[PDB]
Amino acid sequence: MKGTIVGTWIKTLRDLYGNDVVDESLKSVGWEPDRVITPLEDIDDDEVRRIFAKVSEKTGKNVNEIWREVGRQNIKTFSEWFPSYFAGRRLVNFLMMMDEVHLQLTKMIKGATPPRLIAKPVAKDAIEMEYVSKRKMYDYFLGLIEGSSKFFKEEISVEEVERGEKDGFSRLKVRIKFKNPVFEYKKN
Ligand code: HEM
Ligand SMILES: [Xe]
Ligand SMILES: [Xe]
């Protein structure tokens, strides 16, 4: 996982569950409880999973509920630390640019495996968005969508059309409906 983002997860974990739960979880994979992850670092996915396992053991919540909660809250953390991704955007634009953002922010990394998040309009008031990634982080993806709706104060309905593995990649396709029209037909 890219260091920058893992750093957001640590703050978000503090904001959700408190410093003692977080310090002890980090200590438990042998990190400095106060480690600051730089953009010069990448973090092994499995260390992150062990950190979240410890958070689940200490809070009594299942680890998927933790990811879902972290996805929701991490939007606010992103809006504080990387505000230029939010500045003067609406929810629909923010969502449709995510796939590109995720490529741009990992293109400097040798052998990068960003999640793909391709979105396409399927109706005047709805898009489809498909998460595709080896990492299987379905709750984090859903929680980020939920968090995005909260941050932008735009209500959506989220239908999970399908979820499963295909050719070694986890995939989750959702249909996101907005309260008003957001697309119109135009000459292609
Ligand atoms: C300012 C907003 C955001 C930024 C800067 C950002 C950036 C990143 C970066 C750099 C990674 C690491 C990828 C890697 O190391 O391979 C990541 C992980 C991830 N991103 Fe975001 N992200 C943002 C918002 C979102 C949103 C809205 C979604 C979903 C709609 C999303 C979905 C995910 C997921 C599910 C992961 C976990 C990695 C995986 O599933 O393979 N992100 N993000
Ligand atoms: Xe973490
Ligand atoms: Xe992870």
Question: Residue 6 CA: which ligand is closest?
Answer: 2
How many domains is the chain partitioned into structurally?
1
- 135 marked among binding-site residues: yes
Q: Is 177 helix (H, G, I), strand (E, B) or coil?
A: strand
Task: Look at ligand 3, atom 1, and give the residue with the nearest C-alpha.
Answer: 45
Alpha-carbon distance 17 to 116, whole Å?
29
152 among annotated binding-site residues: no
Q: CB of 1 closer than 6 A to ligand 2? A: no
Sheet holding 169-178, edge to edge: 119-123, 126-133, 169-178, 156-166
Which has the closest alpha carbon to 37: 10, 13, 75, 59?
A: 10
CB 47 near ligand 3, within 6 Å:
no
Whether 156 lines ligand 2, by a CB cut-off of 6 Å, is no
Per the annotation, does 131 bind a ligand? Answer: yes
Distance from the CA of 25 to the center of ligand 2, in angstroms? Answer: 9
6 lines ligand 2 (CB under 6 A): yes
Bridge partners of residue 164, in order along the sequence: 171
Could you tell me the CATH number of the domain that includes residue 129? 3.90.1520.10
61 marked as part of a ligand binding site: no
State if residue 48 touches ligand 3 by the CB under 6 angstroms criterion.
yes
Helix, coil or strand: residue 71: helix
Ligand nearest to the CA of 31: 2
Q: Which domain holds residue 46?
A: 1-188
Q: Residue 124 has what DSSP assignment?
A: T
Experimental method: X-ray
Nearest to 142 by CA among 67, 87, 88, 82: 67
Is 172 a pocket residue for ligand 2 (Cβ < 6 Å)? no
Q: Tokens 């958070």 correspond to what residue?
A: 55
128 residue type, one letter: E
Is the separation of the CB atoms in 143 and 69 below 8 Å?
Answer: yes
The verdict on whether residue 173 carries a ligand-binding annotation is no
Q: How far apart are CA 12 and CA 10, in angstroms?
A: 5
